[PDB]
Amino acid sequence: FSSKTEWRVRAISAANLHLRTNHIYVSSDDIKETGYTYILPKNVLKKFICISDLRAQIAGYLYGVSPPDNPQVKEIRCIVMVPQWGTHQTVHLPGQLPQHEYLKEMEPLGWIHTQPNESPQLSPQDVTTHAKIMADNPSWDGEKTIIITCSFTPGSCTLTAYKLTPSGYEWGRQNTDKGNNPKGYLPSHYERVQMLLSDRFLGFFMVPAQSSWNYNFMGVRHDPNMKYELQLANPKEFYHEVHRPSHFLNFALLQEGEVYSADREDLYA
Amino acid sequence: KETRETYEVLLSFIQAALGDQPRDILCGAADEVLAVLKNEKLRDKERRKEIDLLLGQTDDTRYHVLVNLGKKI
Amino acid sequence: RCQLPDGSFRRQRKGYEEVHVPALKPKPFGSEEQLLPVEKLPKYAQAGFEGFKTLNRIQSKLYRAALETDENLLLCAPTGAGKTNVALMCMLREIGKHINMDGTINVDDFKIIYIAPMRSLVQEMVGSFGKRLATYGITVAELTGDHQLCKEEISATQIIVCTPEKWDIITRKGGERTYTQLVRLIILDEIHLLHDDRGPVLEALVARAIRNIEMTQEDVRLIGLSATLPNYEDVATFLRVDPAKGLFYFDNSFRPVPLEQTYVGITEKKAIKRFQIMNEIVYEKIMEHAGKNQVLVFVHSRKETGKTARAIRDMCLEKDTLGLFLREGSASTEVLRTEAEQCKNLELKDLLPYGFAIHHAGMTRVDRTLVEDLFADKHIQVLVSTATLAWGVNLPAHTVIIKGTQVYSPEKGRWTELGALDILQMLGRAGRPQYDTKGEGILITSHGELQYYLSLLNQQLPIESQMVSKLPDMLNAEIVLGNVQNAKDAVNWLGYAYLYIRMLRSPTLYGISHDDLKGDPLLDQRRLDLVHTAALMLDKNNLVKYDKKTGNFQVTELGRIASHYYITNDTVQTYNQLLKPTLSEIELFRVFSLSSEFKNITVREEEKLELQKLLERVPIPVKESIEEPSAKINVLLQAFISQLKLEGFALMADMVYVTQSAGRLMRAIFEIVLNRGWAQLTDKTLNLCKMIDKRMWQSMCPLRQFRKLPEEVVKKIEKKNFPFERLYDLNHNEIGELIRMPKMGKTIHKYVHLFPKLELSVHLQPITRSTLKVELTITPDFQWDEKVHGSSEAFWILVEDVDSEVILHHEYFLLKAKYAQDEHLITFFVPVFEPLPPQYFIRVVSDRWLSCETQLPVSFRHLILPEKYPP
Amino acid sequence: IQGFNISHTQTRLLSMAKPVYHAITKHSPKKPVIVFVPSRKQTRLTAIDILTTCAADIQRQRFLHCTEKDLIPYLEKLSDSTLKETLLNGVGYLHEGLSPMERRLVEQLFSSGAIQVVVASRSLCWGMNVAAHLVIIMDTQYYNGKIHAYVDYPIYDVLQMVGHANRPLQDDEGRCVIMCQGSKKDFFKKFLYEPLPVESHLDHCMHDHFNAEIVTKTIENKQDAVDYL
C-alpha cells in the first residue's frame, strides 16, 4: 500500500461493504456424501464481511458442534478473531490457537477468510497455511476442519468451502515457498465441501482480550509467537479508529495557534 | 477556461499578500494589478517600477510570482 | 427619511461626504428637582451602594416607581446614562420583599433572571454584582451550565444572568420549569436587540412569559432597558407596561458626557482606492487629536488591531518625526512609563516605546489588564482595539474612532455592516465621565450606509421584529412544550408577539394592505394564515403531525430533538433522510456538513490552496467529496478537533462558526440515532460529541481532559504505548518508571485515580421465555473531586444485543456528588428472541468524559428459559 | 401508556401536569376521573394545577356538577382550607393526613356525582371503595430515603390502580392513561396486557418458619424439613 492515498481510497470504499451483505452466492458442486456438511449462520457472515477490507485478507477461526443425533452436519456457532494482518493474497495470524471458556463446549471447524479476487481453487498459500496449522495442532482434525473462502464479486460476495486431502496435507506440511506458484502444487491437494447459509440460528463472535484483532496498521507489533486472551464481544470495523492509532496520533501543533481568533463568542451554555 | 484557470491563482496571490480583505477589496485589487502589468507592450519597468511604486511597498519576491504569472494570461 | 440635529451640517469632500453634529444641550433642572443621595431612599437597599454618594439624574427620576410599584417598567435612555443601577433597584425591591427580622433576605423564596445581550457583559456583570450584593450574602452567578450537571448547582443560585438564547434553550428543555413560579422578576437589558436577527429569541422569551402569566394568574415584574429609539410605546405594549405610570422616555440630551458626532461616508466604488482613503482619513483625524487628548480605534479584525498601529507609527516616521513628541517635553508626561514597560507578551514591545499600543483578547491574558491600567492613567493617548473591549471591562476614551463598520459574518457567508448594539456600545464609550468635558466620536463608513448610522445615534430608527423568518422554529418549540395544542392556541400565542403589535400599528410595512386590514381588524385571519404556513413547514419536515381538518398539532420525537438543540427544521429533516444505521464516521461527518445551518458557507478561491493541505492532514477521509462547501466544513471540523491553526482569516472565523454550532448539531444527531436504537452509530456520535467538546481525538491520552497536566508528560506517556486501563495496577513509583520521569510519579497517579471509573456486577434471572430481568450494580471506582467532577457525573447505561448492533435498552444514570462510593442498584427488563443468543452486553459510558467506558458481557451460555405458558 | 423522556423526577412530574388535564378532556370529559400520585402532598398540588389549567380552557368549574349552595353542608366539616377550594371547583383530594370524616365526605361527593375528579395518594389505591371511568396514573416511581433513590411502583399496585376504572353498572368501557418515564415504558407495554407470571419467595424468607415449625414439632428432624418444603 501507498500508506497515504492508498489508505483513504479503500477506507471510503469499505464503508459500503454492508451493501454486499445482502447479495451472496454459495458454491453448489458435487457432494461427496460421505463427507460432513457445514452450516454457517448468516449473521456472523454478514458481520465478518462488514469488518473486512477489499485488499487485505482478514481471517477468522470457526468453532461449532454437530446437532444432537445428527453427527454428519457441523453447525458453525462461533467465529474467533485473533491479532492478524493480511496481504492481498494471504493472511498472517499467530501460532497460538484460541483458548477460552465459551469455546470449551465446541470443537474447532477450521477458519474463514476474505479473498479480494475470486479464484476457483484453494490458494497454495491456504493449503500450506492449513496443513501447517494441522501439523502443529492435533486439536484440528484433518477430516473435520475446513477453509471457507469468501470472495468479493462485483457488488457481491461469494463463497466456497475446502478440505485438504491427505496428498495436500503432506505437501503443505512440507512447503516453504509462499509464492503464487510453488513447486509440486496440485488440484489433487484440496477438495470442495458442502456448506449452507442459515437464518435458523445465530452465531457469535470471540475477540482479542486487551486489544482488537486488526494489526494491519501495525505490522511490527505482530509476532508469530504472540499470546492473547479472548472475550465475548463483536469485532470493530477494519478502518475503525482503534486499529489506526498512528494516524490519530498525527498532531504536531503549538497551542498558541489558539491566540489567533481570541474572540470567543459562545453564549450557549 | 485557461484564462480563468490562472485568474483564480492570481486572486490567491492577492489574498496571500493582503490577507482576508472584504471581497470588493480583493477583486478590485485584482483588477488593479492585472491592469498595471498587462500592458507589457507598454514595457518599461522603470515606468513599471513607478507604476508598481504607485502601489508602494510589496517587498519583492512575491512581485516576481506575479510577474511570471501575469505573463501567462 | 432622517433628520438633522440642531447645529448640524453636511460638508462633502472628494470621494467622501462628511457630516457634523454638535453636542446636545442638557434639559434645565425642573422646578424643585434635586438628586437623591444614598441616604434618603429606604434603609435596607442602601447597603451595597458604597463608594457612590449620589444617584444619577435619571436613576433619581424613576427610583420611586422602581421601589414602590410592581408595575412593569420601560426606560429609554442614551448610552452612558447608567441604566443598570435602575434595574438593580428593581431587584433590591424583590430582594426586600422577602426579609425577616432575625434573618435577612432568606433566599429560597425568590430567584431573579437578568437577560443581557452579550457574553463579556454577562461575565463582568456577575463579577461586579457578586461583589456589590455580597453584603446581603446573596449568591449570583452566570448561567453557562450544561443542563444536568449544573441545575442542582444553580438550584441554590439567585439573580442569574444569561443571554436570551441560553434562557430559550434551557426553557425548551425544561430546566426553567423547576425554577419558575419562584421567579417574580425578569430584566431585559438592551431590549433594543429586538431589532437584531437575534430579535425573535427575546420575542419568544417575553411572549412565553406573558402568555404563561395569563394561565397561572401569578404575575412577574418585567424591567426593560433600551437605547433611545422610537417605537418605545410598541415595546411598552409588548412588555405589558402601563404607559401611564410605567413608561419612561429620555432623549439623547441625557448622555452624561455630551457627544459631538462625526460621520464620514465614502463615495468611492473601487475598494482598492478606498483602502487608501480611509487610511488617510484615519491619519488626519488622529493628528487632529495628537495634542492633549485621547483616541481609541475599533477595528473589526483580530490581527488588524496591530496592522492599524505601525501604520500610524511608520507614517509618523515618514512625517520626518512630525506628530511625535506626544508629551509635554522630553522627560515630561512619563515617557519612562512607556519605556520602562518594555518586555511584554504581545507585539507591544515595538509600539510601547512610542506613544501608542494595541488591545484585544487574542495575544495575551493579563497584559490586557496591564494595558487597561495604562490607558486609565493616561500614559497612552492612542489605543487601537476590538468591540470586545467596549463590551468587556469598562473604560472610556476622550474621542473614539470606528474604522469601517463592516465585519465578516460566517453565518451570512459574506461581509456585512456590524450590528446596532455593537456601534451603540463602542461609541457609547466616547468621553470620560470624570476627566472629560464633552466626548466626540467618529464613524468612518460607506456613504450608502451613512444615512443609517444617523437614524440610530439620533432617535430616528424604528424597532421592528425579525420574527417572521423564525416563525416555523418558534412554533415547533411551543408545541414541544405543549403550550400550543392546535391552530387556535397558536394564533393566541402569536397574539402575544412583538410582531403582533407591529403588524397592528404598521400593517403597511408588514405586508398588509389597509383594505383587507379593515376586512379583518383583529388580524384573526392573518394570524390564522400566518402560522398555517409554519404548520405546513413543520409537517413537511416531520417535526409535527397536523391535519388541516382538526387544526390540532402532534409532536414527534424529531420535533422535540429539534427544539431542544435549537436546530432549524430544514437541518433536522436533512438528518432524518440522511441518517441510516450503517453509517461510517467517513459519512457521519458529511451528514454533519449538510446541516442547513451552514447553508451560506462557501469555499473561496484563495483559501482552496490551504484547504487542500488540510485535506491531506485529516484522519477521517473526506474524499467522498471534492472542494464544495461540504468539504470545507468537514475539513474544518476535523481541523478544529485535530487542533490545527489556519493561515487565512476567513477560514478561521468560518471554522469557529462551524465548531460552535457543531455541539448542538452532533448532539441532536446522537439523540435521534439513539432514540432509533442503532448501537454503532450512537457510539460514533456520542464519541464525536465528546471529541468536539474536549478538542481531541480518542487516540489521545484521556489524561488530557485534566488540563491540570503538563503537555510534555502527556506526550511522553503517548510515546510509549502502554494501554491506559493498565495504569491502575501500578503504584506511584511504578508509574514514573515507564516514562523515566519519576518526579511526576505521584501527580500522575492522582489523575489516574481522578478519572471516572465504574465497576459493575449483574444478577440476571429469567421471567418469561420472552423476557429476562437484570439487576445492575454500579460501584464507583474513582476518587471524587468537585473541582474536577463537580456536583454530578453523567453516564449512559445501554444494553446492546448479540452483535452490538441493536440497543435493546438504555437508561440515563446520574451519580451525584454525595453518593460516590455508594453502589447504585438499577433494575430493568430486556427481551430475548428465538435464536437464543450467546450473550448480551451491558455498556456504561460517561456523557461528557472521553475514553471513559466499561462493558459487561452478560452470557446466556447457561440460561434455562421457563416453560412456555399454556393458553 | 405515555412515555416521558425526562429522567429528573421533579421536572418529569411537573411536565406531565398539562397532559393530565388533556387526558381528561380527551378520554373522559364528562365522566368520573381518579388520578393517582407518587406523594402524599403531590395530591394537593395536582388538584390545584388541574384547576389552574382549567381556567386556561376559558372553562371554569367544569368538574362541579352541582351548585355551590349544595356543597355548603359538606364543607362545614372541613379543617383543610385548600381542600375547601379544590372541592369548590369540583376536584378535592385524598391522602394519609385527612380525617376519616373528610375522606368519607370526598368519597361521597365523588360517587354521588357532585365532583367529577379526585386526586389520590398512591397509598390509597388499595383501600379505596369508590371507582371511576378514567384513571390516570402519574409518574410510576416514588422516593425512598433509605438508599436515597426513586423506586418503581410494584406491578400489582399498578394493576390495582388500573382496575380502579370499572363502572359495570353504567359504562360500556373504562379508560386508563399511565404516564411514566422512558425507561419504564416498554415494561408496562409488555406486562399490563399479558397474563402475569408469579414466583415463590419462600426461599429467601425461610428461617422464621422453619424455626416456628420446629417449635411445634412439625419438623422433628432434617427429613421432616425437606418434606415440609
DSSP labels for C756-809?
A: --EEEEEEEEEEETTEEEEEEEEEE-S---TTTTTTEEEEEEEEE-TTS-BEEE
A252 contact C CB<8A: no
Pairwise CA distance, residues D59 & C445, whole Å: 58
Q: What is the C-alpha radius of gyration for chain C, rounded to an integer number of angstroms?
A: 31
Residues of A in contact with C584 (CB under 8 A): 14-15, 237, 239
Residues 6+ apart with CB under 8 A from C498: C194, C199, C203, C206, C207, C234, C235, C238, C465, C467
Strand segments, DSSP code E, in chain A are 24-26, 37-41, 59-65, 73-80, 85-86, 91-92, 107-115, 146-153, 156-164, 190-192, 194-198, 204-208, 230-232
Strands C16-21 and C259-266: antiparallel
Range list of H helices, chain A: 5-14, 17-20, 42-51, 124-136, 166-174, 245-248
Strand partners, C358: C384
Cβ atoms C588, C665 nearer than 8 A: no
Backbone dihedral region of C431: left (phi > 0), alpha (psi from -120 to 50 degrees) or beta? left
Q: Is D51 exposed, middle or buried (0-12, 13-18, 19+ CB in 10 A)?
A: buried
What contacts C452, CB < 8 A, 6 or more positions away? C417
**Could you give the 3-state DSSP secondary structure of residue C743?**
helix
Residues of C with CB under 8 A from a CB of B: 270-272, 274-275, 303, 406, 408, 414-415, 604-609, 648-650
Do you know the residue count of chain A?
A: 269
Helix/strand/coil for C712: helix
Neighbours of chain C (3+ CB pairs under 8 A): A, B, D
**Helix (H/G/I), strand (E/B), else coil: A14:** helix
Integer-rounded Cα radius of gyration of chain A: 21
Burial status of residue D160 (CB atoms within 10 A of its CB: 0-12, 13-18, 19 or more) = middle
Last residue before each gap in chain B (C to N over 2.5 A): none
Query: Which letter does DSSP use for residue A83 in this model?
Result: S
Show the cell assigned to B15.
Answer: 489574498
- Residue A116: name the closest of A1, A29, A230, A28 by CA: A1
Nearest-CA residue of chain D relative to C826?
A: D151
Task: Inform me whether the C-beta atom of residue D67 falls under 8 Å from chain C C-beta atoms.
Answer: no
C236 vs A91, C65, C223, C247, C725, CA distance in Å? Answer: 78, 16, 10, 7, 61
Residue that is written with C-alpha cell 456536583 in the block: C791
Which amino acid, residue C467? M
- Enumerate the residues of chain B whose CB falls inside 8 A of the CB of residue C275: 21, 25
Residue numbers after which chain D is interrupted (C to N above 2.5 A) read none
Question: Which grid coordinates belong to A236?
Answer: 470493530
Reported residue count of chain C is 871
* Whether C561 contacts C671, CB under 8 Å: yes
Listed in sequence order, the residues at least 6 apart from C5 whose beta carbon sits closer than 8 Å to its beta carbon are: C21, C22, C24, C261, C458
Which positions in chain C touch A264 (Cβ < 8 Å)?
A: 119, 361
C-alpha cell read off for A103: 469455546
3-state secondary structure string, C437-488? CCEEEEEEEEHHHHHHHHHHHCCCCCCCCCHHHHHHHHHHHHHHCCCCCEHH
Q: Looking only at Cα atoms, what is the longest distance across chain A?
A: 78
Contacts of D131 (CB under 8 A, 6+ apart): D32, D34, D164, D165, D166, D167
The full DSSP string for chain B is: -HHHHHHHHHHHHHHHHH-S--HHHHHHHHHHHHHHHH-TTT--SHHHHHHHHTT----SHHHHHHHHHHH--
From the list C577, C589, C691, the residue with the least C-alpha distance to C630 is C589
CB contact under 8 A, A266 and C303: no
Of C272, C415, C605, the CB nearest to B32: C272
Whether chain A lies against chain D with 3 or more Cβ pairs closer than 8 A is no
Cβ contacts below 8 Å, chain A against chain C, sum to 135
Which residue, among B18, B20, B34, B62, would best test binding to C if mutated, counting the most C CBs under 10 Å from its CB?
B20
Cβ–Cβ below 8 Å for B28 and C415: no
Phi, psi of C271 (to 5 degrees): -75, -25
Closest by Cα among A148, A196, A198, A160 to A41 = A198
Establish how many alpha carbons lie within 13 A of residue C731's alpha carbon, considering only the half-sphere containing its beta carbon. Answer: 1
Is residue A60 within 8 A of residue A79, CB to CB? The reply is yes
Please answer yes or no on whether C272 and B29 come within 8 Å at the CB atom.
yes
d(CA D177, CA D191) in angstroms, rounded, equals 15
CA C54 to CA C39: how far, in whole Å? 9
Measured in angstroms, the CA of B27 and the nearest CA of chain C are apart by 9
CA–CA gap between residue C191 and residue C241 (Å, rounded): 14
Q: What is the CA radius of gyration of chain B?
A: 12
Q: How far apart are alpha carbons C252 and C240 in whole angstroms? A: 25
Rounded CA separation A190/A181 (Å): 15
CB count within 10 Å of CB C269 equals: 10
- Please name the residue that has the C-alpha cell 466604488: C269
Q: What DSSP string runs through C525-586?
A: HHHHHTTHHHHHHHHHTTSEEE-TTT-BEEE-HHHHHHHHHT--HHHHHHHHHH--TT--HH
Dist. CA C38–CA C767, nearest whole Å: 74
What count of other Cβ atoms lies within 10 Å of the Cβ of residue C100?
8
| Cα dihedral C482, C488, C492, C493 in deg (nearest 10) | 40
Cβ proximity of A41 and C836 under 8 Å: no
Q: Which of C174, C827, C828 sits opposite D11 (nearest CB)?
A: C174
At A194, give phi and psi (nearest 5°): -85, 130
What are residue A73's DSSP bridge partners? A37
Residues in chain D: 229
Q: With beta carbons less than 8 A apart as the criterion, state whether A242 and A236 touch.
A: yes
Taking the C-alpha atoms of residue C19 and residue C449, their distance in angstroms, rounded to an integer, is 13
Distance from CA of B64 to the nearest CA of C (A): 18
Environment class of residue B24 by beta-carbon count within 10 Å: exposed (0-12), middle (13-18) or buried (19+)? middle
The C-alpha atoms of residue B20 and residue C329 are separated, in whole angstroms, by 41
Look at residues B3, A101, D199 and name the one whose alpha carbon lies nearest to residue C861: A101
d(CA C204, CA C211): 10
Distance of alpha carbon A15 from alpha carbon C586, whole angstroms:
8
User: Whole-angstrom Cα distance, residue C49 to residue D112?
Assistant: 63
User: Chain D contact for C828, CB < 8 A?
Assistant: yes
Residue type at position C565: Y
Q: Which residue has the cell 503517548?
A: C718
**Would you say how long chain B is, in residues?**
73
Closest CA to C846 of C739, C734, C687, C701: C687
**Orientation of helix C467-480 relative to helix C164-173, angle to 10°:** 30
Q: For residues D212 and D220, what is the distance between their CA atoms, to the nearest angstrom?
A: 12
Q: Which of C280, C278, C312, C307 is nearest to C295 (CA)?
A: C312
Q: In angstroms, rounded to a whole number, what is the distance separating the alpha carbons of residues C690 and C692?
A: 5
The answer to whether residue B6 neighbours chain C at the CB level (below 8 Å) is no
Beta bridge partners of A231: A207
Q: Smallest Cβ distance to D15: which of C177, C767, C827?
A: C177
Set of cell numbers at residue C210: 406573558
* Helix or strand holding residue C10 (H, E): strand C9-12
For residue B21, give the C-alpha cell.
Answer: 480583505
Of residues D143, B64, B25, D96, the one with CA closest to residue C408: B25
Closest CA to A215 of A53, A44, A2: A53
Nearest-Cα residue of chain D relative to residue C868: D197
CA nearest neighbour of C399 among C364, C366, C372, C430: C430
Looking at the complex, report in whole angstroms how far the Cα of residue C633 sits from the nearest Cα belonging to chain A. Answer: 18
C-alpha cell recorded at residue C72:
412593569
Q: Where are the alpha helices (DSSP H) in C594-694?
A: 608-616, 629-641, 649-676, 679-694
Look at residue D33 and give its three-state secondary structure. strand
Let me know if C381 is exposed, middle or buried by CB neighbors in 10 A (0-12, 13-18, 19+).
Answer: buried
Quick check: C867 contacting D, CB < 8 Å? no
Residues D6, D3: Cα–Cα separation, whole Å: 9
Resolution of the experimental structure, in angstroms: 5.7
Dist. CA D70–CA D74, nearest whole Å:
8
Q: Which of residues 107-146 of C touch A (CB under 8 A)?
A: 119, 144-146
Query: In this structure, are residues C595 and C574 in contact, taking their beta carbons and an 8 Å threshold?
Result: yes
On chain D, the residues whose CB falls within 8 A of the CB of C177 are 11, 14-15
Strand partners, C399: C295, C440
CA distance C648 to chain B (A): 6
Torsion of CA C371, C374, C378, C381, to 10 degrees: -30
- Count of CB atoms situated within 10 Å of the CB of A14: 20
Place of cell 365526605: D105
Centroid of chain to Cα D30: 20
The three three-digit cell numbers of residue C246, written as one number: 410605567
Neighbours of C674 (CB within 10 A): 20
Strand partners, C405: none
Query: C388: buried, middle or exposed (CB in 10 Å: 19+, 13-18, 0-12)?
Result: buried
Residues of C in contact with B10 (CB under 8 A): none
β-strand pairing of D175-181 with C356-358: unpaired
Q: How would you write C357-388 as a 3-class SS string?
A: EECCCCCCCHHHHHHHHHHHCCCCCEEEECHH
Q: Are C250 and C62 in contact (CB under 8 A)?
A: no
How does strand C111-115 pair with strand C160-162? parallel
Q: Nearest 5°: CA angle at C342, between C338 and C348?
A: 85
At residue C854, what are phi and psi to the nearest 5 degrees?
-140, 125
Give B 33-72 residues with CB within 8 A of chain C: none
Q: What one-letter code names the amino acid at D77?
A: K
> Three-state DSSP class for A17?
helix
Is D18 in Cβ contact with C482 (below 8 Å)? yes
Show the cell assigned to B45. Answer: 519597468
* Grid cell 398512591 in the structure block, residue: D122
Reduce the secondary structure of C267-329 to three states and give it as a string: CCCCHHHHHHHHHHHHHHHHHHCCCCCCEEEECCCCCHHHHHCCHHHHHHHHCCCCCCCCCCC
Q: Flag if C274 and B25 touch (Cβ within 8 Å).
A: yes
Selection from D197, D196, D228, D198 nearest residue D211 by Cα? D228
d(CA A96, CA C422): 70
Neighbours of A23 (CB within 10 A): 12
Type of residue numbered C125: M
* Cβ-defined contact of C771 to D190 (cutoff 8 Å): yes
Q: Which of C147, C623, C803 comes nearest A234 by C-beta? A: C803
Q: Is A202 helix (H, G, I), strand (E, B) or coil?
A: coil
CA C400, chain centre distance (Å): 27
Vertex A184 angle, CA A181 and A190, to 5° = 85
Q: How far is C363 from chain A (nearest CA, A)?
A: 5
Interior/surface letters C618-653, b for 16+ CB within 10 angstroms, e for the rest: bbbbbbbbeeebbbbbbbbbbbbbbbbebbbbbbbb
Q: What angle do CA A219, A220, A226 make, to 5 degrees?
A: 95
Q: How many CA atoms lie within 13 A of C594 on its CB side?
A: 16
C811 part of contact set with chain D, CB < 8 Å? yes
**C5 burial via Cβ count (<10 Å: 0-12, 13-18, 19+):** middle
User: In the beta sheet, which residues pair with residue C221?
Assistant: C185
User: Which experimental method was this entry solved with?
Assistant: cryo-EM
Q: Give the C-alpha separation, C865 to D1, whole Å.
A: 28
Using a CB–CB cutoff of 8 Å, tell me whether D56 touches chain C: yes
Give how far C548 is from chain D: nearest CA, Å: 19
Identify the three-state secondary structure at position C651.
Answer: helix
Which of the 8 DSSP states describes residue C520? S
